[PDB]
Design a binder for this molecule. Structure first.
Ligand SMILES: [Mg+2]
Ligand SMILES: [Zn+2]
Ligand SMILES: [Zn+2]
Ligand SMILES: [Zn+2]
Lengths: 85, 168, 196, 65, 114, 49, 159, 263, 141, 133, 559, 43
DNA sequence: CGATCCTCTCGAT
RNA sequence: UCGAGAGG
């Protein structure tokens, strides 16, 4: 309460540009803070390039709370969202 | 006829024409059923607003109306075979291309549309020169133009400099 | 600037070698773009060049006085007599290669002005420093090593872009930001914080 | 303010030609064109160097200290 | 103020070597010699001379930015011809030609009066 | 070469700028706007020399 | 005036038609006149269309007016932008100006309104009526030095 | 007699007119530019002013001093101070000059380049002597003094090239024209009525045949003949400008050939 | 001697002026095509003649060469710039102690002059140099 | 292959419309009283008079980077004076059977009208045009 | 207004801007001194530690170095003063305020900021000399030039802040404008001029140049294209070599006037795959056109690929033009002899046409149409008779101008110039206006005191029969000055007004954003639109397209 | 200097426009931009 | 009760 | 601070 259950989720199945940039940002800030990486580095050292790889290999364990104007919200895991951008 | 619409269909066709190396001498492998039903099916998987209720269903139905008009007229059974000379493989690729390209064309929630609108009007308004006009050939063409006129509109001017009434 | 409403900054500096050159070895002191000329319609600039060429050659002052009877034809007549083609064009070779250019260049002397305010007098870069006493915000002017104003217009631009955090950073981390104590009953800055 | 050494454009030494120029005009009574010609200032970049020069030094020397 | 020193046009720094050989990734018998502290005087002269060799397939030079006195020279030669060799021969041919010029000029100079 | 025409106030050179004003003792007639009750006005900017 | 009207054969044609232009407005009375086409009558006074034909008709005229000013100077702005501006003035039921009288009178946040005009006085009436600011506005968050709900901040990110 | 061929027209103490036949434009140009910026010469590189009571600024004079031409005949038997193993300058790497002038006259006393005086040991090499081409014997005016006026300074002349600063140029102006008839069609003439009437003919048109009216455009033809006139400032004699030009290029080509030994 | 007269804008109203002396009062009836199109006499009841039409301009505009071959706003623009162009402001500069003083090393008198420049002492205290310039598309810099 | 098309044409018109090196040439076949040709030709290299009768050929014979023609052991498919390489851009039909093939030789356009070359000229990026005498 | 909605900030920089044809689109040329001043706080991670110590060891004065080092407790160590500056062995979790180096995201801006394109993220490129440097193609969205403009540069202090710049503000992802649903950047000046120049049918290049031009394109496949000509000398066309800069799968078709799919005039456009088939490349192809090569490449290949294209086109073109050269002289305003004769009589017969109408007005024979004065009618007739004159005289000039005419060349490319310009400079300046009417009777019944009372003749009321080449008369001059002054007044007047309009507009629409239900709402959650712009489509993802079922005959629709 | 000494200032119907009567009295060209254009005159 | 934005400099109490 | 001049 309030929320919205996983079944009946009416919002966009695709990730917004604003969602992507906010996710890539937070993960880059996480990596820079010496946080554990969830993908085998390919001679990478930049926190954004690594976060970008983590999103590409769908292993970013962050969640997005989409707020509807009534106050209600829909929780979407980065793992389920589509990146057609 | 020419209006700003999402998805450049012409571009997709030319892309299918080269990709699949279309031959204008050999007859196509398509069916009358394939074209008619295919274009009808493409007009279903198009999304702006999802939903399963009539309110949002009709709302989304209304949003695609003009784009579907373009789609119907461009992807017609005669044109698909006579003009474009599309193959089955090349046809399905066009169908799946539009569907995806359309979804990409949809505005993203969060987009600061208000600020964008204000700036979009503001910039060219600043670039307006000659508060008079360039209609100064005949003396009967004397109406408040440019920046003064834009000021009357936004202010909601009770009394305007050139109040006119054009009758048919 | 020239004497015809033509502002310009030095874009680059080339040595004598790399510069285009005349068959007699003359080389420009300055090169200006032909794209200035059409929109600005400053014909006299082109004229003063034709006359100042004819002037330096003949060893006489050029009469660039207004309401007179000096024609572009008159000047052009005298200049052909002085061995150069009547309109100011002359064969020019590429500095790097030595090959004649396809185009013939409008060469000649034009009186140019050295204007006030140079780069070094303008450059400013601040990455923290003096804060105005009252507001606790960066100071004004290059002179005091101050902050550049991120005005409403700029604030608005970031809003259009949808860069919520960057916009927050500019208004907090850079510039202002402060920590205060609020009473859960008051809602005011009443709390007498006796830290440590 | 004193004759420049060398022509800004080409580099031909000109700072040794001023007195000679001023003499040709005064003592020989001839015109600038034929004066610059006698000093061997062939090119127009060299021609302007001398012909366009305002020798303000002479005015500055009139101040006492 | 941000103005570099005029010696950086012909003077090598530290670690900066004159020639830098990097093999080309796009073509077979091709290489990219990056001549440091040099301009159009060496570039165009060597490039136009490389072209004279019947075994040279491609020869082009570029000065990527005017602020810096570098230049990249790309050579492509026939299989069984090292591009480093083509560069060697080109240089020698120039020296040979330049030599002839000096003598020829000196002979005509000594034949003059004034 | 100096032309003068200026002052020296505590070492600083001062130029007084010519101040444009409407001429005095001039009689001028003006049509007043449509809502206004007075259709025309005659004014005189009388001053003493 | 020149009119683009289709021929009996289907193709569109440049059929010229007589049109009268007025110095003055009395829309209500001029439209009831016989011989005119009351379906086509137009006035540059959008505010006059609003009181005779309704709010939705006014909105359309208001767009025609903003459009016409841009178009005249030789520029083009995508429909959606004027559409939004026009709709913003329209939504109130009548015509709300783009000045302190129009949009600044709105039910919006005291802090977001005092950022435009009549600064101190907006905050005075806010204090008097004891207004509650929901802080959902851009401006209040800019004053508060917080990440506003603008794209990037329009959603909460969690673990 | 191998590749390039030279034919000298004008021979003077200051100018050299010649024909560079059987040569590539890449070479003809490379030679022209190397003469401008890469022949080393001797020019004032540091000024120490002890007394200056003139109307001209310290740096204004210093700047002017740099431009005065000084004998560079034996510049190869002088080192670049950057290569020298001393501290600052010396005799192997520099020439020290002196300038002292005082307004002894009620009239106006002038400072010439003849008034500069060599102080350091030059060791029999022809170097440092100010270049004087004026018929009165006083080449170049440096400054003018009234009465009280006095200018006392010492200056160090150093080895260098124009590529570093224009003061180091034996250079001056180099004329360069190839194909006076535009047979190569290398340029496209701007005109109004007639190109032939509108554009004037060069003195070089006499040393070449005309286009020969109705004949097909020579496709494969390239520039092999080049008309040049090199004029010296005086620091290095004319013949030497061209020979040191040919040589400097040869040297910088050889350095690449030498870099293809170290790697 | 009353060969010249001082006239103000009010008295200007009652008089009839001629631009050129000789050209505006000789006789009536070949012509140079390059020369600008001039009206004629038409009104021949003159009271005064203009000393020189170039006198309508002032000091800053009197420095522009051929402003009559230029678009009017460019002439306005130059008049502001000429007042920011370095050069010998005064011969006694070496003696004046003042905040900001910009002086050109080798000022050059313009090769293209205006008869008005003589009274403005411009060729005596110049503010610019006679630069050899090519109008061209070189490196695109 | 070999050759795709070969015919002797006769020049009807030649015009340098604003161009000083190029000329759009109109020529019909001497044999085929229906066959037509349009061609942008470099007159600076190959001059053509308003009545010349020239032999035209299409080969697509003698992929990969161009090498300078070094005649060490080389011999191209030409005894011809004019050689051009181009690409197909449109295959139009003008009534019944009358074909129309469009070629661009780096912008130098070519249109060939006839009928017979049906199973011949294809959408090939390859197209060598050869003109002799 | 001055401290909350906007304020002065740390990590700022400002300087004169200069143009760089060798910089990339998204790049910015930052002077070394500025780079040496502006710092980015970088946390010590095993990934960077080595490069960071090296920078700490380069110190504040060698560029690829750093200033301040921050320890756990937040205490700063000043690298320009500290005795320990020499040593300093960094620990993980410590911050290193390093110098701003190559390829960093920087918010670059130009005032007035009335556009989201007046604020774009750029790639840092640290360079010598005191000016900020930029690509000519980014000049337009900022509305800058090189007469002396100054630009602002900001530096992100956090990872999320810099991510927001790279993913939302970057120059390539800003190419297509949502404002006008077309691109906001394109090929300009020398490049626009030179493209037309190179792109011609007559334009042919030889091997030596070809290879140099081929190499200049960085993304080059290393494949020498087969020349268009393989006869006496193998020649390449300008079209061929430029097509190398164009990628693959890029299809573009236009049609202008002639464009007979055999384009005899060499107009319109046809680009198939990665090659230009026919048509001269000018503003319509390579400018900020709605259906341009740019709008195509951004939509097809992507922003970063299209951004690369700006560089490629520029490099090839600028180089070819550096060797071809282009000028403009006084000779280009010289408009023949017989053409001038026709121009003169064109104005002369317009002058007679005016006199006759004046005479008819004077005879009271003329009658004005309903609604307007006999005087009101008379004026607008003379006004038209005189505009016709300047235009006819101008057309006469434009026709006489040769293909070689450098002004004609600039207009033809669309680089610089309009008809008006040709007309005023070489044929006739024309009639002058103030308050939208011809020169007023300022003096009692006269424009000037050199005229008689009650004189309505063209010349007397502000008509300038002379060109800028011929020169203006004293009267003509003054009248042109009067008109010119009006321009400058209402230039300043307009700017001061439109500024107030912009803030009002912005403040009114601040809070309007597309929500998570395609609903366009304000700060109160009040619905403005149900679908953004009546379709819920993004402005930059749209283009004008022909609806084929609306036009054509009933017969045509059927077949 | 000269241009400064010959300046005019006009405080506060259309003062900015170059009036007909200004002929030979005030300069038609020389005037500042924006702020006080046409109000600041030069003799 | 607003009347562009941002930037620079000097001088005076 | 208030005041003037200037730059886009
Ligand atoms: Mg500007
Ligand atoms: Zn409390
Ligand atoms: Zn010279
Ligand atoms: Zn030593």
């Amino acid at each position: 309460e309030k929320a919205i259950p996983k079944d009946q989720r009416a919002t966009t199945p695709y990730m917004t540009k604003y969602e992507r940039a906010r996710i890539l940002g937070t993960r880059a800030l996480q990596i820079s803070m010496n946080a554990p990486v969830f993908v085998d580095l390919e001679g990478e050292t930049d926190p954004l390039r690594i976060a970008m790889k983590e999103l590409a290999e769908k292993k970013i364990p962050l969640v997005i709370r989409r707020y509807l104007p009534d106050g209600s919200f829909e929780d979407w895991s980065v793992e389920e969202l589509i990146v057609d951008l | 006829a020419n209006w700003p619409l999402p998805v450049n269909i012409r571009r997709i066709i030319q892309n299918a024409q080269q990709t699949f190396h279309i031959d204008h001498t050999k007859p196509s492998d398509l069916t009358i059923k394939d074209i008619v039903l295919g274009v009808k099916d493409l007009q279903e998987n198009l999304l702006v607003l999802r939903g399963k209720n009539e309110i949002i269903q009709n709302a989304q139905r209304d949003a695609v109306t003009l784009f579907c008009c373009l789609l119907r007229s461009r992807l017609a059974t005669r044109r698909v075979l006579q003009e474009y000379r599309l193959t089955k493989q090349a046809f399905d690729w066009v169908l799946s291309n539009i569907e995806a390209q359309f979804l990409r064309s949809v505005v993203h929630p969060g987009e600061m549309v208000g600020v964008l609108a204000a700036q979009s009007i503001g910039e060219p308004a600043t670039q307006m020169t000659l508060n008079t006009f360039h209609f100064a050939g005949v003396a009967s063409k004397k109406v408040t133009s440019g920046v003064p006129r834009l000021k009357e509109i936004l202010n909601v001017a009770k009394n305007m400099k050139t109040p006119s009434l054009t009758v048919y | 600037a020239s004497r015809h409403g033509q502002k310009g900054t030095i874009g680059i500096t080339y040595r004598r070698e790399d510069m285009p050159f005349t068959a007699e070895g003359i080389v420009p002191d300055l090169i200006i773009n032909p794209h200035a000329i059409p929109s600005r319609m400053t014909v006299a600039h082109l004229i003063e060049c034709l006359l100042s060429k004819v002037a330096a050659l003949s060893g006489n002052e050029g009469d660039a006085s207004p309401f007179t009877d000096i024609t572009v034809e008159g000047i052009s007549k005298l200049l052909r007599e002085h061995g150069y083609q009547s309109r100011g064009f002359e064969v020019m070779y590429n500095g790097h290669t030595g090959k004649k250019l396809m185009a013939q260049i409008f060469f000649g002397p034009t009186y140019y002005q050295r204007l006030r305010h140079m780069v070094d007098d303008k450059i400013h870069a601040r990455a923290r420093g003096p804060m105005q006493v009252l507001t606790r915000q960066p100071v004004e002017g290059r002179s005091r090593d101050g902050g550049l104003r991120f005005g409403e217009m700029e604030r608005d631009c970031m809003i259009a872009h949808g860069a919520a955090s960057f916009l927050k950073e500019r208004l907090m981390e850079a510039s202002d930001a402060f920590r205060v104590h609020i009473c859960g009953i008051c809602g005011l800055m009443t709390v007498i914080a006796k830290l440590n | 303010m004193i004759v420049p050494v060398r022509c800004f454009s080409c580099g031909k030494v000109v700072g040794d030609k001023w007195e000679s120029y001023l003499n040709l005009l005064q003592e020989d009574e001839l015109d600038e064109g034929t004066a610059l010609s006698r000093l061997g200032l062939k090119r127009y970049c060299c021609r302007r160097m001398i012909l366009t020069h305002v020798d303000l030094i002479e005015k500055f020397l009139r101040y006492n200290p | 103020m941000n103005a570099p020193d005029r010696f950086e046009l012909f003077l090598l720094g530290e670690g900066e070597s004159k020639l830098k050989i990097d093999p080309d990734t796009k073509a077979p018998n091709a290489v990219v010699i990056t001549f440091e502290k040099e301009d159009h005087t060496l570039g165009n002269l060597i490039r136009a001379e490389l072209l004279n060799d019947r075994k040279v397939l491609f020869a082009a030079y570029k000065v990527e930015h005017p602020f810096f006195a570098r230049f990249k020279l790309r050579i492509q030669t026939t299989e069984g011809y090292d591009p480093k060799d083509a560069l060697k021969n080109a240089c020698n041919s120039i020296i040979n030609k330049l030599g002839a010029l000096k003598t020829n000029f000196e002979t005509e100079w000594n034949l003059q009066t004034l | 070469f100096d032309m003068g025409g200026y002052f020296i106030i505590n070492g600083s050179e001062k130029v007084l700028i010519a101040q444009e004003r409407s001429a005095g003792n001039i009689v001028q007639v003006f049509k007043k706007a449509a809502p206004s009750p007075i259709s025309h006005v005659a004014e005189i900017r009388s001053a003493l020399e | 005036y020149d009119r683009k009207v289709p021929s009996p054969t289907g193709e569109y044609v440049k059929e010229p038609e007589w049109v009268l232009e007025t110095d003055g407005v009395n829309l209500s009375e001029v439209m009831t006149v016989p011989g005119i086409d009351p379906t086509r009558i137009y006035t540059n006074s959008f505010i006059d269309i609003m009181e005779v034909l309704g709010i939705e008709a006014g909105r359309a005229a208001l767009y025609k007016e903003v459009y016409n000013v841009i178009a005249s100077d030789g520029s083009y702005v995508n429909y959606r932008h004027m559409a939004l501006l026009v709709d913003v003035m329209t939504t109130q039921g009548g015509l709300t100006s783009v000045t302190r009288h129009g949009f600044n009178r709105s039910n919006t946040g005291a802090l977001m309104r005092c950022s435009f005009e009549e600064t101190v006085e907006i905050l005075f009436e806010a204090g008097a009526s004891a207004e509650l600011d929901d802080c959902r506005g851009v401006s209040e968050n800019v004053i508060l030095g917080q990440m506003a709900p603008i794209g990037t901040g329009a959603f909460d990110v969690m673990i | 007699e191998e590749g390039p061929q030279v034919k000298i027209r004008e021979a003077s103490k200051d100018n050299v007119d010649f024909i560079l036949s059987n040569v590539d434009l890449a070479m003809a140009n490379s030679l022209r530019r190397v003469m401008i910026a890469e022949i080393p010469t001797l020019a004032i590189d540091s000024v120490e002013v002890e007394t200056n009571t003139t109307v001209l600024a310290d740096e204004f004079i210093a700047h002017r001093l740099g431009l005065i031409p000084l004998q560079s005949m034996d510049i190869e038997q002088l080192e670049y101070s950057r290569d020298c193993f001393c501290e600052d300058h010396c005799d192997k790497c520099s020439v020290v000059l002196t300038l002292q002038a005082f307004g002894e006259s009620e009239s106006t006393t002038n400072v010439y380049s003849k008034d500069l005086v060599i102080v350091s040991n030059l060791m029999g090499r022809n170097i440092g002597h100010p270049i004087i081409q004026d018929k009165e014997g006083n080449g170049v005016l440096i400054c003018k003094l009234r009465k009280g006026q006095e200018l006392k300074l010492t200056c160090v002349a150093k080895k260098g090239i124009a590529k570093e600063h224009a003061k180091w140029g034996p250079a001056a102006a180099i004329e360069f024209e190839y194909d006076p008839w535009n047979k190569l069609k290398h340029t496209d003439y701007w005109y109004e009525q007639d190109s032939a009437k509108e554009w004037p003919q060069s003195k070089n048109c006499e040393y070449e045949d005309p286009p020969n009216e109705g004949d097909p455009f020579d496709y494969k033809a390239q520039a092999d003949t080049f008309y040049m006139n090199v004029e010296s400032v005086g620091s290095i004699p004319v013949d030497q400008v061209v020979v040191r030009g040919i040589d400097t290029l040869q040297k910088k080509v050889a350095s690449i050939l030498l870099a293809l030994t170290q790697m | 001697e009353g060969l010249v007269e001082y006239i103000d804008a009010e008295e200007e109203e009652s008089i009839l002026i001629a631009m050129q002396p000789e050209d505006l009062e000789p006789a009536e009836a070949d012509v140079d095509p390059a020369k600008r199109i001039r009206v004629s006499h038409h009104a021949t009841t003159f009271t005064h003649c203009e000393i020189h039409p170039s006198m309508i301009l002032g000091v800053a505009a009197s420095i522009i060469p051929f402003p009559d071959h230029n678009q009017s706003p460019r002439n306005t623009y130059q008049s502001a710039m000429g007042k920011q162009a370095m050069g010998v402001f005064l011969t006694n500069y070496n003696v004046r102690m003042d905040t900001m003083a910009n002086i050109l090393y080798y000022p050059q008198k313009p090769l293209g002059t205006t008869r008005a420049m003589e009274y403005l002492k411009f060729r005596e205290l110049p503010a610019g140099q006679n630069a050899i310039v090519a109008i061209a598309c070189y490196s695109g810099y | 292959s070999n050759t795709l098309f070969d015919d002797i044409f006769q020049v009807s018109e030649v015009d340098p419309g604003r161009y000083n090196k190029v000329c759009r040439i109109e020529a019909a076949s001497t044999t085929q009283d229906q066959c037509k040709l349009t061609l942008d030709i470099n007159v600076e290299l190959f001059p053509v008079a308003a009545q010349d009768s020239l032999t035209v050929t299409i080969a697509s014979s003698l992929t990969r980077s161009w090498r300078p023609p070094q005649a060490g052991d080389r011999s191209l498919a030409d005894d011809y004076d004019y050689v051009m390489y181009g690409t197909a851009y449109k295959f139009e039909e003008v009534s019944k059977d009358l074909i129309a093939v469009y070629y661009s030789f780096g912008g130098l356009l070519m249109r060939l009208e006839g009928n017979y070359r049906n199973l011949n000229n294809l959408k090939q990026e390859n197209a060598y045009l050869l003109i002799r005498r | 207004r001055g401290n909350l909605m906007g304020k002065r900030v740390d990590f700022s920089a400002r300087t004169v801007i200069s143009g760089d044809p060798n910089l990339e689109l998204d790049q910015v040329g930052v002077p070394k001194s500025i780079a040496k001043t502006l710092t980015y706080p970088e946390v010590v991670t095993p990934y960077n530690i080595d490069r960071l110590t090296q920078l700490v060891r380069n110190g504040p004065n060698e560029h690829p170095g750093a200033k301040y080092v921050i320890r756990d407790s937040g205490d700063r160590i000043d690298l320009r003063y500290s005795k320990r500056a020499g040593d300093i062995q960094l620990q993980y979790g410590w911050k290193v305020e390093r110098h701003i180096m190559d390829n960093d995201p920087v918010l670059f801006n130009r005032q007035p900021s009335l556009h989201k394109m007046s604020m774009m993220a750029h790639r840092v490129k640290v360079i010598p000399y005191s000016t900020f440097r930029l690509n000519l193609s980014v000049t337009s969205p900022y509305n800058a030039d090189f007469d002396g403009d100054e630009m602002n540069l900001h530096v992100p202090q956090s990872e999320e802040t810099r991510a927001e710049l790279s993913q939302l503000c970057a120059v390539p992802l800003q190419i297509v404008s949502p404002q006008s649903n077309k691109p906001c950047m394109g090929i300009v000046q020398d490049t626009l001029c030179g493209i037309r120049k190179l792109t011609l049918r007559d334009t042919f290049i030889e091997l030596d140049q070809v290879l140099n031009m081929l190499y200049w394109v960085p993304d080059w496949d290393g494949v020498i294209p087969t020349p268009a000509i393989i006869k006496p000398k193998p020649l390449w066309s300008g079209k061929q070599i430029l097509s190398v800069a164009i990628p693959n799968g890029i299809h573009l078709q236009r049609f202008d006037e002639g464009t007979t799919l055999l384009s005899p005039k060499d107009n319109g456009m046809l680009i198939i795959d990665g090659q230009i088939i026919f048509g001269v490349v000018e503003k319509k192809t390579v400018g900020s056109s709605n259906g341009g090569l740019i709008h195509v490449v951004t939509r097809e290949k992507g922003p970063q690929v299209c951004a690369k294209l700006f560089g490629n086109i520029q490099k090839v073109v600028n180089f070819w033009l550096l060797h071809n050269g282009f000028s403009t002289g006084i000779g280009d305003t010289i408009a023949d002899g017989p053409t001038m004769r026709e121009i003169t009589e064109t104005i002369a017969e317009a002058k007679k046409k005016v006199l006759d109408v004046t005479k008819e007005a004077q005879a009271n024979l003329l009658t004005a149409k309903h609604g307007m004065t006999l005087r009101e009618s008379f004026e607008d007739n003379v006004v038209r008779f005189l505009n016709e004159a300047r235009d006819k005289a101008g057309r006469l000039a434009e026709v006489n101008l040769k293909d070689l005419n450098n002004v004609k060349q600039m207009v033809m490319a669309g680089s610089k110039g309009s008809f008006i310009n040709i007309a005023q400079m070489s044929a006739c300046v024309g009639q002058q206006s103030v308050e939208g009417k011809r020169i007023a009777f300022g003096f009692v019944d006269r424009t000037l005191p050199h005229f008689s009372k009650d004189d309505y003749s063209p010349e007397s009321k502000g008509f300038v029969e002379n060109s800028y080449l011929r020169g203006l008369t004293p009267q003509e001059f003054f009248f042109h000055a009067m008109g010119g002054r009006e321009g400058l007044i209402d230039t300043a007047v307009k700017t001061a007004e439109t500024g107030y309009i912009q803030r009002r507009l912005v403040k009114a629409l601040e809070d309007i954003m597309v929500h998570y239900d395609n609903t366009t709402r304000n700060s109160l959650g009040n619905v403005i639109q149900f679908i953004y712009g009546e379709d819920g489509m993004d402005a930059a993802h749209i283009e004008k397209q022909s609806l084929d079922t609306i036009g054509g005959s009933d017969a045509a629709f059927e077949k | 200097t000269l241009s400064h000494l010959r300046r005019t200032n006009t405080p506060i119907a259309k003062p900015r426009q170059l009036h007909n009567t200004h002929w030979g009295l005030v300069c038609p060209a020389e005037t500042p931009e924006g702020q006080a254009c046409g109000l600041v005159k030069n003799l």
